[PDB]
Structure formats: C-alpha cells, structure tokens
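Handout for the seminar on molecular recognition.
Each group receives one record of this type.
Step one: identify the two inputs.
Step two: read the structure output and locate the region that could contact calcium ion.
Step three: write two sentences on what you found, then compare them with the reference statements printed after the record.
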Amino acid sequence: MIMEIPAIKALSRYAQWVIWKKERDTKIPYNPNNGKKASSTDPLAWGDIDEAQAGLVRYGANGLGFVLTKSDPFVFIDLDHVLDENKRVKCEWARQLLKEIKSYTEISPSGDGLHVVVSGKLPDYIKHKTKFDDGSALEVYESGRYMTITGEVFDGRDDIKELDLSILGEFAEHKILDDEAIIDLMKRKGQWPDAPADGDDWSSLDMSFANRLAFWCGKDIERMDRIFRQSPLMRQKWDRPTAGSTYGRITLKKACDFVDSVYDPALRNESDCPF
Ligand SMILES: Nc1ccn([C@H]2CC[C@@H](COP(=O)(O)OP(=O)(O)OP(=O)(O)O)O2)c(=O)n1
Ligand SMILES: [Ca+2]
Ligand SMILES: [Ca+2]
Ligand SMILES: [Ca+2]
C-alpha cells in the first residue's frame, strides 16, 4: 500500500524508521525491533521500513515514523488543524501555502491536519512554531525530531520535491531624528533608491546608495547607518560578520573614502546623478 508511494520509496532507503503510540496527547516513538522507547538522536534505536512494518504489528503501534537527522535533507512542514470534517483546507493561510509549496502532502493521523515533506533547507530566521488565532499552527523541523508517516496522500501530491523554502518567511513568525529631513531631501532630489528587483546585483545597489548617503549625510557614519536601515536596500547581510567588521560597516566606510563632496546645509548641487 504505502511502500509504492514515491515519497515512501525515498524514505525507505534509510534505516531511520520508528513506530509510535499515542500516550495521552503526545506521540512517543518506539524502537520497532525491541519495542522500547526510542530516542531521536540514537540511530541504533531505529530500523529500516521492514522492521518498522513488522514491529508495527507486533507491539500494536498507532503508525510508522521517520526520524529527521542532520545528514538527510527532508524538511517536515506540519500544518495543524487546517482541514474541516470533509478533509478540505479550511484555513486561508494553508490554502496559500499549498499553492506556494507543492511537494509530498499527506493527511496527519488525527485527520484534520496536513504534513508537507520537502527536500531543502529552512530559513534560519523563522520560528519552529507559529500559532494562529484560528487554532491552526505552522511548524517546521529539519532534524532532532521524528515525523509520523501515514501515506494518506493529499491532492495527489505523492512525490518529495527539492524546493526553495524562502516563501515560508511570509507565513511563519520571525525572530531576532534629523534623518527624516535628510531622507525627504533625498527623495526630493531623486536620490532615494527603489526596492531591488530580480536579477539585480543587490551588493552593487548598496554601494551606489551608500556613496550618495556619504554625500547627503556628511560622512556621519552613524547617520548613514540609521538611514540605510530605513531604506528598501536593507537586509540581513548588512549586519553579517565579515573580516572583523560587518558587510554594512565595510560598505559605509568605503563610501566615506570614495566621495569628496559633502552636503553642509548650504547648496546641494554637488554630486551624484538621480536614480
Ligand atoms: N520528541 C518528539 C516526538 C514527537 N514530536 C513529533 C511527532 C509528530 C510531530 C507532529 O506533531 P503533532 O501535530 O502533534 O503530530 P502529528 O503526526 O502531526 O498528528 P496530528 O497533527 O494529526 O495531531 O511532532 C516531536 O515534536 N518531537
Ligand atoms: Ca500535525
Ligand atoms: Ca504539531
Ligand atoms: Ca535534515
């Protein structure tokens, strides 16, 4: 039955299978060989799919499980309480997520949730759990955990695909004065940049804007930094460590060395063509 699904065929290549039983409102994984409680970090507590299938009958478990490790690339996307009694997606965020992420999708054991399995890499800035007022929730896991495997294929999505998971950052929660006069003057003179499009060298747009910022802000490297973070060119790379500094501070220091003219509340017909 399930072992013919292409996603189950892919997971069957690994000896990372367990079985699970519903102890109250949690799901405890078990070693399918000896029947003792299994650990998600000890590989010898697992077995292949055939030992999990056999151990499922012997000890009478609720279903199969697959342990996610730091060495296999499977991403477990858990959508809690997104289906109605007819197994139709009732949450609007889940309908949009399933449109943006098309991979193996199965109905979770309780019958009202969904599991999405993707071969990729999670964004490092999203939380592992995001609760919604709907009562639904979005959970993402890459390792140190096991996921229940039902095989109840949803919408014919029976194959694990390799996808980029940046779109998850728009569905899940994330984690960790006189500038306005300068900003208005820059927009006035056409010195304020647009948001970067697709195919553009974002790093090249940073230096051009930083060069302009070095002129209008008077090489006040702290003011140039405050204004850049309020610009459409801001991103995580700005604060990323690079050779003892940050990519942002190295860029702002380069801009100060590159420009000669300086706006000094007097006249502003000195440097740099408008965007
Ligand atoms: N140490 C463990 C063991 C259990 N879980 C895993 C097991 C399944 C997974 C998903 O959580 P649930 O939604 O509660 O289980 P489910 O398989 O998705 O079942 P359902 O969503 O239908 O209730 O979490 C975990 O977080 N880490
Ligand atoms: Ca779930
Ligand atoms: Ca859950
Ligand atoms: Ca992994």
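Reference statements: The radius of gyration is 26 Å. The chain has seven helices and twelve strands.
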